[PDB]
C-alpha cells in the first residue's frame, strides 16, 4: 500500500521527471539542474509508466495513467499535456 | 485495483512499446508512427518492467515479467521473443 | 501479491540494471555482457522506479524507492549509492 513512481530523463544535465501515483492522482516532480519543482502534470490514475525522447532539443513525454482496466496516454510536446491516441482494442 | 503498464520508446519518429499486465497476463501495444496495434508479446505476469536499446537501427527489448517471486526475462532482438538468461540468484 | 521490478540499460553492449522490490527490500541485478551478478544496491522500498543517463562513458542512475507516501532517491555517480535531493510535491 505504497505510492507508485515512474521516472524518465534526458540530456547530460540532466532533466528528470518523476511521476507519482498516490490515492488515484498522479503528480509530477521536475529536475532541470537547479532543484526539484512541482510540475504541470496532474491527472488521475492509480498506476503510471513513462517514456520520453528528444527531437533535437525538444523533449516529448508520454505518461500512461491506468485506473482499473483503462490506461490513458498524456502527451507533452512542449505545448502542454494533451491526451493521446493510445487505446488497447 | 488497476492494471500495471511499462513503456519504452526509441528513435525520433518515435517507436513506442507499451506493455500491460492485466489479470495475470502481459500484452503489448505498439506505435511506429501510423497508429497503435497489438504486439506479438504475450507471456504470463502480474508485474512488468521494460528496457530497450539501439545498436544502430536495430532495436533490442528486455521485458521483466514477474509472477510471485519469479521474474522471467523476455528478449526481442529481431527474430522473435526468446526467454533470457536473467535470474534473481 | 507479487514482486515489482524496474529496469534501465545503457550502451551498445549493453549494461542492464534490474531492481526488484520484495517484502520491503530492493535489490539489484547487473548485466555487463558476461552474465548476471548481484549489484551493490540494497535499500528499502515497497516500490521502485529508475532512470539513468550517460555523460560520455560514465553512467548515472537514480533509483526512486517508495514506502508509504515517502519516496527516496538513490544516486549512482560512480562512487556508491548516495541519497538524493528529491522530495515530494
Ligand atoms: C543483454 C542480455 O541478452 C541476452 C543474451 C545475448 O547475448 C539475454 O539472455 C541476457 O539475459 C541479457 O538480456
Ligand atoms: C515547466 O514546469 C514545464 C515542465 O516540464 C515539462 C517537460 C513537463 O514535465 C511539465 O509538466 C512541467 O511542469
Ligand atoms: C499525435 O500527435 C500523435 C501522438 O504521439 C505519438 C508518439 C503517440 O503517443 C500517440 O498516442 C499520440 O497521440
Ligand atoms: C559493481 O558492482 C558496480 C555495479 O554497477 C553499478 C553501475 C551500480 O549498478 C552498482 O550497484 C553495481 O554493483
Ligand atoms: C546533483 O545534481 C544532485 C543530484 O543529481 C540530480 C540529477 C538529481 O538526481 C538530484 O536529486 C541529486 O541530488
C-beta separation of B39 from B59 below 8 A: no
Asked if residue B88 belongs to a domain, the reply is no
In a domain? residue B16: yes
Contacts of A20 in chain C (CB under 8 A): 66, 71, 88-89
DSSP for chain C, please give it: ---EEEEEEETTTTEEEEEEEETTEEEEEEESSS-EEEEEEEEE-SEEEEEEEEETTEEEEEEEEEETTEEEEEEESSS-EEEP-----
Q: Is the CB of C59 under 6 A from ligand 5?
A: no
In a domain, C33, yes or no: yes
The minimum CA-CA distance between B41 and chain A, rounded to whole Å, is 14
User: Would residue A89 count as lying in a domain?
Assistant: no
Give the residue numbers spanning the domain of C48.
4-83
Report the side by side order of strands in the sheet with C81-83: C47-55, C58-67, C70-76, C81-83
Q: Which of B5, B7, B16, B35 to mutate to test the pocket of ligand 3 (most atoms within 8 A of CB)?
A: B16
CA pair distance B75, B11, nearest whole angstrom: 19
C-alpha cell at C36: 548476471
d(C-alpha B68, C-alpha A42), whole Å: 32
Cα dihedral sign, C5-C62-C59-C51: positive
* DSSP per-residue string spanning B58-71: EEEEEEEEEETTEE
Q: Tell me the CATH number at C62.
A: 2.40.128.190
Taking the C-alpha atoms of residue B7 and residue A49, their distance in angstroms, rounded to an integer, is 6
> What residues are paired with A68 via a beta bridge?
B2
Selecting from B3, B11, B27 the residue whose C-beta is nearest the C-beta of A66 gives B3
Count of domains for chain C: 1
Beta-carbon contacts of A34 under 8 Å, excluding residues fewer than 6 positions away, are none
Amino acid at each position: 500500500s505504497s505510492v507508485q513512481t515512474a521516472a524518465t530523463s534526458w540530456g547530460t544535465v540532466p532533466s528528470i521527471r518523476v511521476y507519482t501515483a498516490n490515492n488515484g492522482k498522479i503528480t509530477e516532480r521536475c529536475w532541470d539542474g537547479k532543484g526539484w519543482y512541482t510540475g504541470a502534470f496532474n491527472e488521475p490514475g492509480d498506476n503510471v509508466s513513462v517514456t520520453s525522447w528528444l527531437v533535437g532539443s525538444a523533449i516529448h513525454i508520454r505518461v500512461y495513467a491506468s485506473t482499473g482496466t483503462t490506461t490513458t496516454e498524456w502527451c507533452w510536446d512542449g505545448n502542454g499535456w494533451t491526451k493521446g491516441a493510445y487505446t488497447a482494442t
